[PDB]
Design a protein around this ligand. Structure first.
Ligand SMILES: *[C@@H]1O[C@H](CO[C@@H]2O[C@@H](C)[C@@H](O)[C@@H](O)[C@@H]2O)[C@@H](O[C@@H]2O[C@@H](C)[C@@H](O)[C@@H](O)[C@@H]2O)[C@H](O)[C@H]1NC(C)=O
Ligand SMILES: CCCCCCCCO[C@@H]1O[C@H](CO)[C@@H](O)[C@H](O)[C@H]1O
Lengths: 119, 119
């Protein structure tokens, strides 16, 4: 079922409803929120206008009542967030996370059936 | 003029402030005790501009020889508020009238009245 997003950083990014489990097999929004919370300093410095949406699109993925196929962000969204923010993370000892590697995401419009979120 | 010591407002783009502020806080410790109550909102990151906007009022910028207060531009407040007011209202906290945006100058509306913007 669809549930109103309760992860504070992921409200006001363009959609209201999510569903668990997410990509990472978090079972609740609480669990997902406790993890995405750690990215707040990266969102604050604005190394990429895409980062917050990209993160939320994975941690609290959009839920549409009638749609049951996954709606990941598009690869291009990941790539822009990574290009923007990776150097800064790298500068603080953090690598771009394994679970966020962009090549796991669909390319926009490559397959008619495979939809994805652009920003 | 004096070095900024409230932890939230260090490293925000300017280093010096002047007491009293527009809240008639006589010390940075008094000012910081109030602005730190907003700290959870900074970590929530409903707006990247929030911290700068709050600090620009609680630990206002002090400029050598200027001897006059310099407020944030209205647009700075409007971005902070557009991002964070919805979450504050949901959590039962009214956007305080003291940080109303129409109390602040619009950049360039009167060339003689200065304000700080940011990105
Ligand atoms: C996205 O959500 C907003 C806010 O909805 C309210 O808060 C969420 C957490 C739930 O608790 C909802 O039941 C609440 O309505 C929607 O905006 C509101 O819509 C009406 C009721 C109006 O009173 C307005 O002032 C509210 O802000 C918004 O429509 C929704 N977007 C959609 C559905 O596309
Ligand atoms: C846990 C989520 C926190 C939501 C943000 C609340 C920020 C606190 O904002 C509150 O505003 C009021 C203005 O008079 C006063 O009670 C306090 O100055 C201040 O704590």
């Amino acid at each position: 079922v669809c549930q109103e997003i309760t992860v504070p950083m992921c409200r006001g990014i363009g959609y209201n409803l999510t569903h668990m489990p997410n990509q990472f097999n978090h079972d609740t929004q609480d669990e997902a929120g406790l993890e995405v919370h750690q990215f707040w300093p990266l969102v604050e410095i604005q190394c990429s206008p895409d980062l917050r949406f990209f993160l939320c699109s994975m941690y609290t993925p959009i839920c549409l009542p009638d749609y049951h196929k996954p709606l990941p962000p598009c690869r291009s969204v990941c790539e822009r967030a990574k290009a923007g923010c990776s150097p800064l993370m790298r500068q603080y000892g953090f690598a771009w996370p394994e679970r966020m590697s962009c090549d796991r995401l669909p390319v926009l419009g490559r397959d008619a059936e495979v939809l994805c979120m652009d920003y």
